[PDB]
Design a binder for this molecule. Structure first.
Ligand code: MG
Ligand code: MG
Ligand code: MG
Ligand code: MG
Ligand code: MG
Ligand code: MG
Ligand code: MG
Ligand code: MG
Ligand code: MG
Ligand code: MG
Ligand code: MG
Ligand code: MG
Lengths: 204, 198, 198, 204
């Protein structure tokens, strides 16, 4: 490392896609010395310590999935309180029932989506490209292709878990490398765009 | 397991500078799926075998330094012939333009004089003066080099650069990358590998 | 997340040669949990802050080159003072022996002349002659350097080594590592970090 | 890479332990230019192609777990036939009902243990050190400590899956880094020693 800035992401899907969207947005990560570091999981806290104010004091952002669970809080709320514990001033406000630490997280460069990466891509308008990739990569049934056509016509009808099943057949990392070809500024999910603008400005 | 194209480079400086110049030229390596691969030396031949026609037939380019030698042919001559032997059709001051046809690009000296000739001399001086503690003498040497790039003393520049580390130096210098300071041989290799992947 | 000790080195050559010399001295870095960490340059100070008393207080050593300069103090002087400032108790041609007390080891020139002085000259010549295409003149230069290490021409050795790549060169040279060709400053740093981890 | 030789292993446990046993055995991997490469899984076939006779032709070995399953063949038998397909001359013998491809695998540098790494370490005589590490790292019950004392007195009584549960509480990679301190030539499992001698000789 010893980048001028770091984008911490969960996996290799993000590692392919984030630099592709940055290119689409004309945000120059290589000129600015910004690196994308996958933690191969959801445990950013060891990296935050090493890199945060106590450590090397390197500008950084975190991109992570909300991971909503049925009849339970989103997995990301607790994972975000842990990162905030290592980075926030010792005032300890309510954070809106401490289940709304999101806004304070964004001030510190921690960005959470509304579900998980691949449904967010579909909802951000990449549905046609995701369908192209899945039908080029997999051997598919007519039932699958028609489910994908329907989701493209109405992304609100999208079944997230059947989508990820399809993608896990491809491999999330291989899927994302193929989807990177389709990145445009208008199909970048908001949380990725926010994080790229944040880290560009932190470094500059 | 696969990339749409590969840019082969010699070392850490190109690893950091080629992606910066690609951004300054608006060439989207990550969207095109083009990666930059350093061979940490000057022997590209094993890699060209893996990914060339012999093997995976992945589109690729090579960036290498001429390495001109006093009273000898420059070192890149035999280096290119060796790569051409493994890539070309049936048929030295000869192989340069044929090499470029196959994505093999040689500069006219070595990376760092080329950057000075291309207009990055002010950036190189800024990087060196802000990262190192320097004597007035080296700072005046750098001022001469900027106002006349032909005056460049390469033993001295490289010693300065090795104090920083070639990769650290290049990462700092990337922040000054622009389209008008991109050496021709890098710009041509980048346009070539973008055309190729298309 | 943690190692029992760290050996900080400047670059790729030490990355490959320090573990080879440790094997030739029967110092078991993997059993002791000691890792070798290259800083890719000459600025050790940020790392010493992370792992020194200021931070994790992991036992560590530093291997760095003197970098002697004509009509100046050698570059390592200020470099060591900067690291000593961050490591030492309250109180230049001074700081060397105090530096060694804290695991900071400086050679007398730079790695590669030191290897020649220590007896590895025949290996360096073998590596260079078998990996490069060479002129008779460079092969006679290497023969002079082997029979008299004081005659060594460092501009020329380094140019040869950069044709190979410093890390490739050092990995090939590792195969010749022995206890009797290990420079003193490497041997002392290795014994020091083994004592420290115990 | 571009090592003179490669030891392909499954995970980071092996990545810590193999070089420790090599030191204990006075097999000089750094002098010989031999590297230990974790594939973070059990899928060596992509690496074998890149590195084998068709690829860079680099001397290499594979260390992998038998992975015995109850009422089923060992998982390693099929995983080994796949690697052998990419490396063996096209004679295609019986391999002893093709469920005994082990001997031919060892000729090609593919070494399989009898269960999985951590029980094999216990059985090779490291049981006392494994007990030390577990009781230093974990908070343990008296029931656990007495089960470990019993296994140390008679490794044949060892319960493999309770051992790995204990170790998975520590983290297999962190466990192995701590166990490396205990490596000796006499506690090296045979399959690791065989592989180290093979790759040392292939390189020399
Ligand atoms: Mg880019
Ligand atoms: Mg996730
Ligand atoms: Mg648009
Ligand atoms: Mg642009
Ligand atoms: Mg060069
Ligand atoms: Mg260079
Ligand atoms: Mg020994
Ligand atoms: Mg040096
Ligand atoms: Mg050196
Ligand atoms: Mg060793
Ligand atoms: Mg296993
Ligand atoms: Mg013994």
């Amino acid at each position: 490392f010893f980048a001028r800035g770091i984008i911490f992401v969960e996996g290799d899907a993000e590692r392919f896609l984030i630099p592709a969207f940055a290119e689409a947005l004309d945000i120059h990560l290589d000129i600015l010395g910004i690196s994308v570091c996958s933690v191969s999981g959801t445990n950013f806290a060891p990296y935050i310590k090493l890199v945060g104010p106590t450590g090397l004091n390197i500008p950084h952002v975190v991109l992570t999935d909300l991971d909503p669970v049925d009849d339970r809080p989103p997995l990301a709320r607790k994972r975000l309180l842990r990162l905030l514990e290592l980075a926030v001033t010792d005032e300890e406000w309510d954070e809106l029932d401490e289940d709304e630490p999101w806004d304070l997280g964004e001030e510190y460069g921690y960005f959470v989506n509304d579900s998980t990466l691949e449904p967010e891509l579909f909802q951000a308008g990449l549905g046609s490209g995701i369908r192209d990739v899945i039908e080029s990569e997999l051997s598919t049934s007519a039932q699958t292709r028609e489910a994908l056509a329907c989701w493209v016509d109405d992304p609100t009808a999208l079944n997230n878990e059947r989508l990820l099943k399809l993608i896990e057949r491809i491999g999330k990392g291989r899927f994302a490398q193929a989807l990177a070809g389709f990145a445009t500024a208008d199909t970048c999910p908001a949380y990725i765009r926010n994080a790229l603008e944040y880290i560009r400005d932190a470094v500059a």
